[PDB]
Design a protein around this nucleic acid. Structure first.
Lengths: 186, 223, 125, 66, 86, 180, 155
RNA sequence: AUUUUAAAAUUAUUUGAAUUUUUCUUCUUAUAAUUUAAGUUGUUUCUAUACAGUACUUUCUUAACCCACUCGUCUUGAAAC
RNA sequence: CCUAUUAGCUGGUUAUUUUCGAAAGAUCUCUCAGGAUCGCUGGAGUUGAUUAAUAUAAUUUUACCAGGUAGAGAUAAUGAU
RNA sequence: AUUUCACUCAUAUUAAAUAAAAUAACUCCAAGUGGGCCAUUUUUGGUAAGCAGAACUGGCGAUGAGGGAUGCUCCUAACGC
């Protein structure tokens, strides 16, 4: 016998292989795995890792936020491993060249009409193998409603977690333990 | 591309003669050290003005007990001494911190002064090395100087010749030699122990404790 | 005991039998992992119906080949032999159990003229 | 019948199973109820710094965009 | 690369010389030192002994100092015991 | 040389002093001489006696030299002197000692077996003191005078012990007990 | 059955022999700053602002300073984890710690030693030694100096 | 099938070199080999000059040496009277 | 027939290999054969590390703290004697 | 106190030692568990108990192997073929 942590087997955490059976996504994963292995760049390694991430970790990126992120380099390539969505709050958009998995068709039309162009990851690999002049971005990973119920339980002091309730009215989990008048608050 | 093969060919002779001069200096240093220690010892004899060595600055420790029924801090000291199996051996640099931490596992180990022939034997016939990248080491017997140079050559300790000369005399690099070495996996003693239960210093036969110079016979009997 | 013939090494013969299947006749010899509480076989007691484990796994260089030194392939009719024209030395032929007499004959003849051996060549004649 | 009233056995084995977790030690701590009338003036100090920078950047942008 | 046999780095001469480029020189130097003839060790031993006569005399001095120290420690122990006897 | 007959003791003398401190600028150097199973055991015993008789241990004691000082002639015949102090299951007692072997090394060992066999005193319970030399006519023991008698003889009430090679199981006839 | 705020503090909160009486007058002249290491030791002569049961003898940083109070950030071990705790005590119960006094004079050493040595271009290490083996040197002992010591019998 | 190669050692040279002082003294300038490199190869027999036996493979049945308490379950603890 | 009423209780709960692997503490509870909640565990995932170093450590060293158990005392106080 | 500019405090062995220290950190979902017992040392009640109740660590439980003839807990030692 020997005294080792977990009998001496290194344990890794997270995704190991792509779960999706989308053949185009499998081809993309193979291409970028090869690129990351052969080319030394961390750019391709990051893209290969992000391509196999779950849906909740490929969050959408709005046109307005994408333009804001790309404001300080107008001639570079904005690459995201999520999907690009349109922002109606944005009055005008200009000259953005964006590589992404998906473009909502309204956002695609807006990008083309603004003079820019939309690229897929095969195009990005073909004409930017090492990610030169490419800035990779990602949308808000934990802005979705699920994380609003995570963290400290609602009922712990200073807890911002949303409870799971049928309705959000006056009669639904608002009386005791949520206001000082009825026993305690929070 | 034809220039590449010849420029990688000439560098082999360049480094060969570099280490050839370096080993001439090495052997001169070694014989000078041998002459200095004996001459100081001899000068100690004419008049009542003595000479000695201190603690040898390096000790070899062999674990004696298994993995079951051990106190938590004994287990922790074993872990950070890299002494995990019932017959593992490691070199430990001797100072106040290591000596105090070794005193707590004293009844479960036996340790002593290695001496040059024994450390050379340990490295030559039981020496295995951690080759892989950080935390991915993949234990490998030495069998060559290439990996020693790859991990330590940029730190000018390339070679088992250089590396025994660093383990025996506790030189400026132990962090990169002792840590580089995999823990020695030793056989049971050829003629057996006396009693793992009892101390080497008890009048009754026993094994654990500081054997000092008496660990060389145990090592080459377990080797 | 390990049986060794040529390069083919089999770490164990006499396949594992279910515990107490010898003395209980509603217990079939087919192996079953004994859950139990104090089972004497789950606990790995001495001299009692040792359990199968991955350690007995045969070398994958010689995992599925017969004493033929070939992998067996079961064929059901002619033209199902076609892939073996390129592997006549790595594969042997076994005819499906439910193949008629002259259907058997006409694929035995094809296999022989194809230079691929047949395991059960003396069946139904 | 009678129950085991109490024991601390195995408890710190469980504690050291996942180690003794240490506080995260973030760089900044909230000043929510810490020394008021002092951090109010620090708010004023910070505003005094941002005030000039905003208009300086606006002037630079206008002069460079013509 | 494939794992071959781990050759004995002590008895396999080629492997040991590959690991230690100075080993062949050191071993040859020792081998010729053994090869030195019996007459060489026969003729110089008396000279080497008369050259160490002084060293063994000094060691006699060193050890006889210890013998005198032990003797006088014995003497004072006996004197103190005899004083305390009554 | 017969290893079955042999003990495992040689001479040691390792020179040092208590640790010099700022408080005591020049502590006196000191000395003591004993034998045990090996040099490290002798050092441990010496430090045990240092702690018990004075106030100094390994932690506050160092040395400056070490040597092995064999005897003048190993194969002599000697008469030396020590004294014993041992504790029993209910008290503590003492005596002197002098036994005859070739030299100092094995002089200690014959007494340990004697004490173990007669009083069941383990070696951890025995202290030997003050190695010196003794006379011959001053023995007050019933045996040791005739050791140096002018002329002495006894017969050979020996019971044979032979080699395992010839210690055969089935004998042709019953052996006798006179020999010679 | 009894777990009051001062339970089990008979001797811990008692005043030492000869040490009774209120705190000295010049104890109120300690320059406490934020992020300062401080030892929290109860002074039972002062009842208000008294530290609680477990924090006597602990050490922590100042995260808050008030007109006569001090907020100390003490980690406390709770089952499987250590957590930070904000203890608010009076200044009588707080004493500037001597943990970083080992580091502070070394950082003073640096600005006067490393500054000159670097420009002189001498490579000198600064890390602490943790002295072990005793280096080889030359010694002189007179033959008169060697006195002896020898064992003892039972009485 | 684009490192069982480079070196390492050995042999037969050879060039210069050196030092222990030379028939296992040491290092490249060059050559050609070899393995101690660079995890076992060779020779002779037998099977055997047969198409299944008295041989070889395998199943089964009996012994023999050592070992082996009815499982499932509740239980701190089950072979449990 | 409602009704396959309810049961914090007893018994049972069906293929293989591989990998990880517990608790019998604690808080509350008309609670003490139960439950909820922490703790221990598995799976999933991200951020990291992969750079013999940093984070880190049931470890030691150096520096500095806090203690009133063992011991000691009736001369130092109470309580004894 | 904050901010911005300067200078710069080993970093080419690492502001002490050691470290199969990133096998880390964090998040989510959820199982089982919440009758425990034994050994050394300490200790309360009891004349005592294989008694009742606690502290530390290790085990039994959940675990086989060699030894103690025999034995859930002892010693050695933990387990692929």
């Amino acid at each position: 016998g020997i005294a080792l942590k977990n009998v001496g087997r290194i344990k890794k955490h997270g995704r190991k292989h792509l779960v999706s059976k989308n053949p185009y996504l499998r081809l993309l994963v193979k291409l970028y795995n090869f690129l990351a292995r052969r080319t030394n760049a961390n750019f391709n390694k990051i893209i290969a890792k992000r391509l196999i991430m779950p849906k909740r970790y490929r969050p959408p990126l709005s046109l307005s936020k994408l333009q804001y992120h790309m404001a300080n380099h107008p001639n570079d390539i904005a690459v995201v491993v999520g999907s690009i969505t349109d922002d109606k709050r944005l009055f005008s958009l200009k000259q953005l060249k964006v590589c992404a998995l998906r473009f909502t068709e309204t956002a695609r039309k807006r990008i083309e009409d603004a003079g820019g162009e939309c690229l897929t990851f095969d195009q990005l690999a073909l004409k930017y193998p090492t990610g030169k002049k490419c800035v990779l971005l990602r949308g808000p990973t934990k802005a979705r409603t699920a994380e609003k119920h995570f963290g400290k339980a609602p009922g712990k002091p200073k807890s911002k977690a949303r409870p799971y309730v049928r309705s959000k009215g006056r009669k639904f989990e608002k009386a005791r333990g949520r206001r000082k008048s009825r026993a305690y608050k929070k | 591309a034809a220039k590449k093969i010849k420029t990688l060919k000439l560098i082999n002779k360049k480094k060969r003669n570099d280490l050839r001069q370096r080993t001439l200096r090495y052997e001169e240093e070694y014989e000078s050290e041998r002459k200095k220690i004996i001459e100081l010892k001899r000068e100690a004899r004419k008049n009542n003005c003595f000479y000695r060595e201190a603690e040898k600055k390096v000790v070899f420790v062999i674990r004696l007990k298994g993995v079951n029924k051990l106190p938590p801090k004994v287990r922790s000291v074993f872990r950070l001494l890299r002494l995990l199996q019932v017959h593992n051996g490691v070199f430990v640099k001797v100072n106040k911190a290591t000596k105090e931490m070794l005193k707590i596992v004293e009844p479960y180990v036996t340790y002593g002064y290695p001496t040059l022939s024994t450390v050379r034997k340990l490295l030559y016939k039981r020496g295995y090395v951690r080759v892989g990248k950080v935390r991915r080491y993949a234990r490998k017997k030495i069998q060559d100087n290439a990996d020693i140079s790859k991990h330590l050559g940029k730190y000018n300790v390339h070679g088992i010749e250089d590396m025994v000369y660093q383990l025996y005399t506790c030189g400026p690099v132990f962090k990169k030699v002792n840590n580089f070495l995999w823990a020695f996996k030793l056989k049971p003693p050829r003629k057996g122990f006396k009693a793992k239960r009892h101390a080497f210093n008890e009048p009754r036969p026993g094994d654990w404790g500081n054997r000092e110079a008496h660990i060389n016979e145990l090592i080459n009997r377990m080797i | 005991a390990v049986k060794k013939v040529g390069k083919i090494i089999k770490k164990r013969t006499k396949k594992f039998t279910r515990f107490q299947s010898n003395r209980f006749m509603r217990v079939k010899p087919a192996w079953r992992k004994p859950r139990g509480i104090d089972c004497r076989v789950r606990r790995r007691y001495k001299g009692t119906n040792l359990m199968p484990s991955i350690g007995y796994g045969s070398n994958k260089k010689t995992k599925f080949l017969l004493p033929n030194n070939k992998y067996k392939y079961v064929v059901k009719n002619v033209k199902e032999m076609e892939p073996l024209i390129m592997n006549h030395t790595k594969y042997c032929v076994q005819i499906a159990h439910n193949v008629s007499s002259k259907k058997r004959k006409q694929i035995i003849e094809r296999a022989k003229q194809m230079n691929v051996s047949v395991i059960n060549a003396k069946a139904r004649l | 019948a009678k129950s085991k009233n109490h024991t601390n056995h195995n408890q710190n084995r469980k504690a050291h199973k996942n180690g003794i977790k240490k506080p995260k030690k973030h760089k900044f701590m909230s000043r929510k109820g810490l020394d008021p009338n002092f951090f109010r003036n620090q708010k004023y100090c910070l505003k005094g710094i941002q005030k000039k920078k905003k208009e300086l950047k606006l002037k630079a942008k206008q002069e460079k965009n013509n | 690369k494939k794992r071959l046999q781990n050759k004995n780095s002590l008895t396999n001469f080629a492997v040991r010389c590959r690991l230690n480029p100075a080993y062949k020189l050191l071993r040859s130097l020792a081998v010729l030192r053994m090869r030195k003839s019996i007459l060489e060790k026969s003729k110089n031993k008396k000279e080497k002994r008369v050259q160490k006569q002084i060293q063994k005399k000094e060691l006699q001095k060193i050890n006889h100092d210890y013998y005198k120290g032990v003797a006088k420690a014995v003497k004072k122990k006996k004197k103190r015991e005899e004083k305390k006897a009554k | 040389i017969d290893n079955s007959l042999n003990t495992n003791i040689h001479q040691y003398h390792i020179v040092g002093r208590a640790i010099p401190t700022a408080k005591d600028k020049n502590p006196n150097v000191y000395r003591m001489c004993i034998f045990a199973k090996n040099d490290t055991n002798a050092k441990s015993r010496f430090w045990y006696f240092m702690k018990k008789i004075n106030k100094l241990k390994k932690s506050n004691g160092e040395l400056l030299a070490c040597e092995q000082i064999k005897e003048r002639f190993p194969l002599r015949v000697k008469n030396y002197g020590v004294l014993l102090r041992y504790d029993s299951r209910t008290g503590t007692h003492n005596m002197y000692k002098e036994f005859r072997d070739t030299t100092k090394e094995g002089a200690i060992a014959q007494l340990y077996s004697e004490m173990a066999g007669r009083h069941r005193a383990r070696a951890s319970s025995i202290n030997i003191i003050r190695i010196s030399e003794i006379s011959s006519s001053l023995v007050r023991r019933p045996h040791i005078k005739q050791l140096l008698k002018r002329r002495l003889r006894f017969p050979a009430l020996h019971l044979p012990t032979l080699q395992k090679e010839y210690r055969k199981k089935f004998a042709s006839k019953r052996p006798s007990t006179y020999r010679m | 059955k009894s777990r009051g705020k001062r339970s089990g503090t008979r001797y811990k909160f008692s005043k030492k022999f000869r040490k009774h009486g209120e705190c000295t007058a010049n104890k109120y002249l300690e320059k406490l700053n934020y992020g300062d290491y401080v030892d929290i030791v109860c002074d039972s002569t002062q009842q208000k602002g008294m530290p609680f049961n477990y924090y006597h003898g602990k050490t922590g940083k100042i995260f808050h300073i008030t007109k006569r109070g001090v907020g100390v950030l003490v980690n406390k071990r709770v089952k499987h984890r250590i957590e930070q705790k904000k203890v608010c005590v009076r200044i009588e119960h707080v004493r500037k710690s001597r943990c970083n006094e080992d580091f502070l004079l070394r950082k003073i050493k640096n600005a006067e030693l490393i500054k000159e040595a670097k420009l002189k271009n001498e490579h000198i290490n600064i890390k602490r030694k943790t002295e072990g083996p005793k280096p080889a040197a030359m010694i002189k002992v007179p033959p008169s100096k060697i006195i002896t010591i020898e064992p003892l019998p039972f009485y």
